[PDB]
Design a protein around this ligand. Structure first.
Ligand code: CHL
Ligand code: CHL
Ligand code: CLA
Ligand code: CLA
Ligand code: CLA
Ligand code: CLA
Ligand code: CLA
Ligand code: CLA
Ligand code: CLA
Ligand SMILES: CC1=C[C@H](O)CC(C)(C)[C@H]1/C=C/C(C)=C/C=C/C(C)=C/C=C/C=C(C)/C=C/C=C(C)/C=C/C1=C(C)C[C@H](O)CC1(C)C
Ligand code: SF4
Lengths: 203, 160, 41, 80, 203, 63
């Protein structure tokens, strides 16, 4: 398999079964037995929150540049008023995040336990692997089932698109901190003068 | 906060800027204006004026002495006085504590463990000094897995 | 270098080379960023 | 004067007697070690209390043990 | 075997197998076999950068004196203004040499591992020795891949000895600029007029 | 007697320097009447600088 560094030995824990495995654990953050089960679940929420993050940071800002949404910038979106209080929407989120993540917390701890419904137990999730809750609510098209070689490719495509979005969202964060311009305008200021709009010029 | 005026509007803090340049300007009066020691005092004045314009722009609190005071309680205005450089420090200090702890584990399973502390194995040292970058994820990871602490049955204890 | 680098890897030389680099770094931080009482970041 | 006590951890290495500068310790026969000898302190009234025997005892913890008690002209080391 | 000091005994670590080996090790810093292979690799890129250095110092300044080109002096060439700032010219070069020298870093550590092009796996370098990569990108004429080893060693000896003259020359150009404050072609023509007086002791 | 020669034991003697420490048995005396027959060698010295000490089998457990 290809690795993150040619001529470097792959670690004994990353053996190449996991989708997206390029032997990249230089600091040994997943060495310990039982630890790599937690770090895949951590990678999967972070990659999917970043692909949700990149679709809310770049896509409404790109369509603002075209001018068919007129949405405000994401770093000034916390100052925008809504039908609810901005402080109130935090706690309503973390009451709903208290439900959705603790159902996810029990799946990492005890797999195959919380696939059944808390209310109407005929509705059961069809997901078998940890971190892939297949069911009508999450995978209505049934794209998460098939051959293991076919399933590994689409799980490789989640995390390779997911690691790009993590780098993307981490980039927009630092761009809005030192330049105070939204990141689609940072792209359009880089296609005009690329050698004068660089991280050293923005300090 | 705590009876302290901000340093940008403190009359005592502006008085200390006035009497510091005036001390350095009187030092400049006995030198030629293009001389080499006069360039050092001219660089000292610009270092002083950079310092006073930096302290007032960070929201520092100045007392009745005209001196910037640090609020270390954890105020949302005052994070860079104690909380922000404290978290910067503890990351660096935990980096020192994690690569010195991981070096001792790496040399305890060696042929002569005491010759690797007077003569520090630099390829063994430098391969874990890079690994001390991500140390809160490795210290609490060893704490949760039980590898951080040693059980008291295997610890040398002085008798009662 | 089987023994010259062993002498260079001893405790006083590596303390001199690290603290020479450490005080060399902290002086050069204190030149381009002097009088630093508050971390702005 | 000083009370020098020998314990059963002794290996009969004899170096407590060899380090003694006032001839307190002697090696008596014994059945509790490979050397088949243990130290004893018959002339413990001649003990200065210097604990050279405790410095030369290789047993952890020490087999010879000197307890500084009542001090007389023997254990003060005077010539006047 | 030609040697630098014909009465002296050659060192044990310099057995003459290396190209350009003349037994010159009075301080003996290449005594360790693991450090000798690093220092030969250090001397190869030092030789080729100085020959590339000597063609940018002594070749265009000779054309500057002859009026062929109007290029500035090599000491003040970095001070000139370009379309890219010289602070951000470095980080373009540092990024481009993290792929050039970082992939060269793996070849010194693990020989025969970075010889395959990652974008297209059919392209590969026709090289077997460390420090001489071969292939179409580095040896397009095929002169460095010969069946006979005596001609191949002499051609690598020709590369080293041409290199170490330039490492004297670029170091010679540095101290001449610090002492005379004059271009080394102009120092040559001043020395070609009156070589008795126009020297380092001309002050 | 003794646990084993060449085995790893842990000292239960309270007054030793190597209490709750890993030691290697180098000699067990099989002569009767010996109070402390098991000779245990340690990787670390005590304050006297020695690493060789004699313990009874009741003051050691296999670890
Ligand atoms: C987890 C992602 C996340 C990130 C990166 C941010 C980042 C930010 N929020 Mg924010 N928020 C985020 C989630 C949320 N915010 C808010 C509610 C607010 C409010 C009310 C405000 C911010 C503001 C800010 C900005 C300044 C705060 C700061 O200095 O940060 C370090 C900063 C860009 C402030 C702002 O926009 O000022 C420019 C502000 O007033 N946020 C809610 C509740 C709905 C969130 C949900 O999790
Ligand atoms: C810094 C660049 C540089 C480096 C890394 C080397 C490295 C080497 N030269 Mg070398 N040279 C270098 C510049 C020059 N050399 C020479 C002239 C020679 C000769 C005649 C010979 C060598 C040889 C060698 C090899 C001996 C092993 C050793 O002890 O290395 C230790 C050296 C260093 C670590 C660099 C010096 C450190 C610096 C002064 C401080 C080694 C590969 C010998 C050989 O067998 O080559 C195959 C040999 O016979 N060199 C000249 C002309 C004066 C140079 C430029 O000034
Ligand atoms: C929080 C983020 C996060 C998390 C949970 C992980 C988790 C994982 N990664 Mg990683 N990855 C991420 C970010 C993340 N990744 C991003 C953004 C990149 C692109 C640069 C990659 C690129 C990548 C590769 C190419 C591979 C891994 C792999 C690994 C696995 C083993 C190493 C490990 O446990 O890292 C744990 C990491 C953390 C706990 C994050 C610590 C971050 C520190 C505190 C600060 C870093 C600052 C940052 C640079 C800014 C594990 C599944 C390997 C694997 O098999 O995957 C299946 C693999 O080969 N990763
Ligand atoms: C976790 C991901 C994430 C988060 C933090 C949000 C959160 C935000 N977005 Mg965003 N966005 C995202 C992903 C994300 N977005 C994605 C997946 C898309 C689709 C490609 C968009 C499309 C989008 C648009 C079109 C707009 C926002 C807006 C909003 C704001 C209010 C949402 C709303 O109207 O309630 C929706 C409530 C529901 C129940 C549904 C808020 C700042 C709005 C904004 O900026 O305020 C004017 C806005 O108009 N977003
Ligand atoms: C680049 C996008 C990407 C990719 C390749 C996938 C790929 C995968 N996801 Mg994932 N996921 C993503 C985004 C992504 N996801 C994000 C943003 C979220 C948060 C909303 C999720 C939430 C999520 C869960 C929790 C589950 C999956 C599951 C699936 C699997 C089957 C569905 C499928 O083929 O999706 C194809 C994806 C696309 C065609 C992208 C559409 C982009 C639109 C147009 C925008 C597959 C491994 C399911 C699974 O494995 O169950 C067995 C499952 O239930 N994912
Ligand atoms: C998906 C990855 C990605 C992409 C394509 C971009 C693209 C862009 N970024 Mg960047 N950015 C990234 C991630 C990304 N970034 C990350 C991870 C960081 C956080 C450390 C930053 C922090 C950053 C700063 C602070 C600046 C940019 C800016 C820029 C532009 C010029 C490049 C530059 O000088 O900074 C490159 C900086 C890096 C650290 C390179 C990281 C890229 C790898 C792939 C990750 C360019 C359009 C500049 C801008 O505003 O443009 C006008 C600018 O000021 N970015
Ligand atoms: C290898 C790294 C290492 C680690 C992780 C620690 C960590 C520990 N030591 Mg410390 N210590 C070390 C080196 C180390 N030490 C060395 C080199 C010395 C000699 C100067 C000591 C002398 C020592 C004393 C005197 C005390 C501790 C104590 C402590 C505890 C709290 C930290 C503290 O008091 O500040 C650190 C204390 C210092 C005196 C600074 C020394 C740290 C040096 C600079 C690190 C050198 C590492 C490098 C690889 C060589 C903690 C268990 C305290 C304790 O009993 O536990 C609660 C305590 O009383 N240590
Ligand atoms: C633990 C005690 C302690 C603490 C918290 C600090 C922390 C600080 N001192 Mg320091 N200082 C200390 C002990 C301490 N000092 C001692 C022991 C000495 C005598 C050797 C000094 C003499 C000293 C010098 C001469 C300088 C600092 C400076 C600084 C700053 C460092 C900024 C940077 O990037 O570097 C920071 C506010 C510099 C600064 O910015 O002053 C505010 C500076 O001028 N300090
Ligand atoms: C490739 C090697 C080389 C060459 C051919 C030159 C040539 C020249 N140098 Mg020199 N120089 C060299 C390297 C070189 N140098 C090195 C390594 C240093 C650093 C010590 C200097 C520093 C230096 C100073 C500071 C000055 C010269 C000057 C001169 C000129 C007058 C001669 C003189 O006084 O020499 C002085 C020579 C030395 C100080 C060092 C000896 C040079 C090498 C190491 C020995 C010979 C090597 C090799 C056998 C040369 C082959 C020549 C061949 C092609 C014919 C002359 C054109 C002077 C000038 O500008 O003239 C007007 C001047 O002031 N040189
Ligand atoms: C071996 C030995 C033996 C034992 O060990 C002892 C001893 C004695 C130690 C030894 C010896 C040593 C020596 C002699 C050394 C030296 C070296 C050198 C001089 C190098 C250089 C080296 C050098 C080099 C690389 C160089 C490089 C260069 C360059 C890049 C340049 C560039 C440039 C150009 C083009 C031009 C422009 O306009 C500018 C610039 C940009 C500037
Ligand atoms: S020195 Fe200690 S172990 Fe040796 S004979 Fe005397 S009392 Fe026994």
């Amino acid at each position: 398999r290809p690795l993150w560094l040619p001529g470097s030995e792959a670690p004994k824990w990353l053996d190449g079964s996991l989708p997206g495995d390029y032997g990249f654990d230089p600091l040994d953050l997943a060495a310990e037995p039982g630890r790599l089960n937690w770090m895949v679940q951590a990678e999967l929420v972070h990659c999917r929150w970043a692909m949700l993050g990149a679709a809310g940071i770049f896509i409404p800002e790109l369509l603002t540049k075209i001018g068919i949404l007129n949405t405000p910038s994401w770093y000034k979106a916390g100052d925008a008023t809504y039908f609810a209080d901005q402080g109130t929407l935090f706690i309503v989120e973390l009451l709903l995040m208290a439900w959705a993540e603790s159902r996810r917390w029990a799946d990492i701890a005890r797999p195959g336990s919380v696939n059944t419904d808390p209310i109407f137990p005929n509705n059961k999730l069809t997901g078998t692997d940890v971190g892939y809750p297949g069911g009508l609510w999450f995978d209505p098209l049934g794209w998460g089932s098939g051959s293991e070689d076919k399933l590994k490719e689409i799980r490789t495509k989640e995390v390779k698109n997911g690691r790009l979005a993590m780098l993307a969202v981490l980039g927009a964060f630092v761009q809005a901190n030192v330049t105070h311009v939204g990141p689609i305008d940072n792209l359009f200021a880089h296609l005009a003068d690329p050698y004068h709009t660089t991280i050293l010029q923005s300090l | 906060v705590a009876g302290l005026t901000p340093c940008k509007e403190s009359k005592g803090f502006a008085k200390r800027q006035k009497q510091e340049i005036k001390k350095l300007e009187g030092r400049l009066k006995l030198y030629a204006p293009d001389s080499a020691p006069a360039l050092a005092i001219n660089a000292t004045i610009e270092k002083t004026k950079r310092r006073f314009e930096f302290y007032g722009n960070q929201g520092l609190l100045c007392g009745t002495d005209g001196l910037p005071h640090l609020i270390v309680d954890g105020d949302q205005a005052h994070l860079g006085e104690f909380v922000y450089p404290g978290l910067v420090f503890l990351y660096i200090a935990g980096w020192i504590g994690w690569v010195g702890r991981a070096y001792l584990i790496d040399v305890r399973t060696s042929k002569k463990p005491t010759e690797k502390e007077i003569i520090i194995d630099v390829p063994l040292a430098l391969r874990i000094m890079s690994k001390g970058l991500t140390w809160p994820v490795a210290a609490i990871g060893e704490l949760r897995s039980g590898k951080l602490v040693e059980k008291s049955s295997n610890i040398t204890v002085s008798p009662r | 270098m089987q023994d010259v680098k062993t002498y260079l890897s001893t405790a006083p030389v590596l303390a001199t080379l690290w603290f020479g680099f450490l005080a060399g770094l902290l002086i050069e931080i204190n030149r381009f960023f002097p009088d630093a009482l508050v971390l702005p970041l | 004067a000083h009370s020098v006590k020998i314990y059963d951890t002794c290996i009969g290495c004899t170096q407590c007697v060899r380090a003694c500068p006032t001839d307190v310790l002697e090696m008596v026969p014994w059945d509790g070690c490979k050397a088949s000898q243990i130290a004893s302190a018959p002339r413990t009234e001649d003990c200065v209390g210097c604990k050279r025997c405790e410095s030369a005892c290789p047993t952890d913890f020490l087999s010879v043990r000197v307890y500084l008690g009542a001090e007389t002209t023997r254990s003060m080391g005077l010539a006047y | 075997r030609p040697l630098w000091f014909p009465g002296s005994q050659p060192p044990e670590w310099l057995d003459g197998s290396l190209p350009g080996d003349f037994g010159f090790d009075p301080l003996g810093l290449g005594s360790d076999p693991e450090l000798l292979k690093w220092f030969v690799q250090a001397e190869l890129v030092h030789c080729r950068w100085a020959m590339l250095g000597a063609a940018g110092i002594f070749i265009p300044e000779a054309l500057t004196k002859a009026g062929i080109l109007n290029t500035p002096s090599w000491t003040v060439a970095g001070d000139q203004q370009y379309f890219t700032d010289a602070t951000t010219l470095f980080v373009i070069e540092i990024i481009l040499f993290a792929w050039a020298e970082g992939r060269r870093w793996a070849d010194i550590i693990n020989p025969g591992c970075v010889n395959v092009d990652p974008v297209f796996p059919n392209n590969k370098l026709t090289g077997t020795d460390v420090g001489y990569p071969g292939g179409l990108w580095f040896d397009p004429l095929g002169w460095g891949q010969t069946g006979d080893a005596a001609k191949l060693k002499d051609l690598r000896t020709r590369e080293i000895k041409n290199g170490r003259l330039a490492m004297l020359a670029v170091l010679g150009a540095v101290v001449q600029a610090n002492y005379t404050h004059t271009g080394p072609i102009d120092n040559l023509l001043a020395h070609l007029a009156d070589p008795g007086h126009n020297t380092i002791f001309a002050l | 007697i003794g646990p084993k020669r060449g085995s790893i034991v842990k000292v239960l003697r309270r007054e030793s320097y190597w209490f709750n420490d890993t030691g290697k048995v180098v000699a067990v005396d099989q002569a009767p009447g010996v109070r402390y027959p098991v000779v245990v060698r340690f990787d670390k010295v005590n304050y006297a600088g020695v690493s060789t000490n004699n313990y009874s089998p009741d003051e050691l457990e296999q670890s």
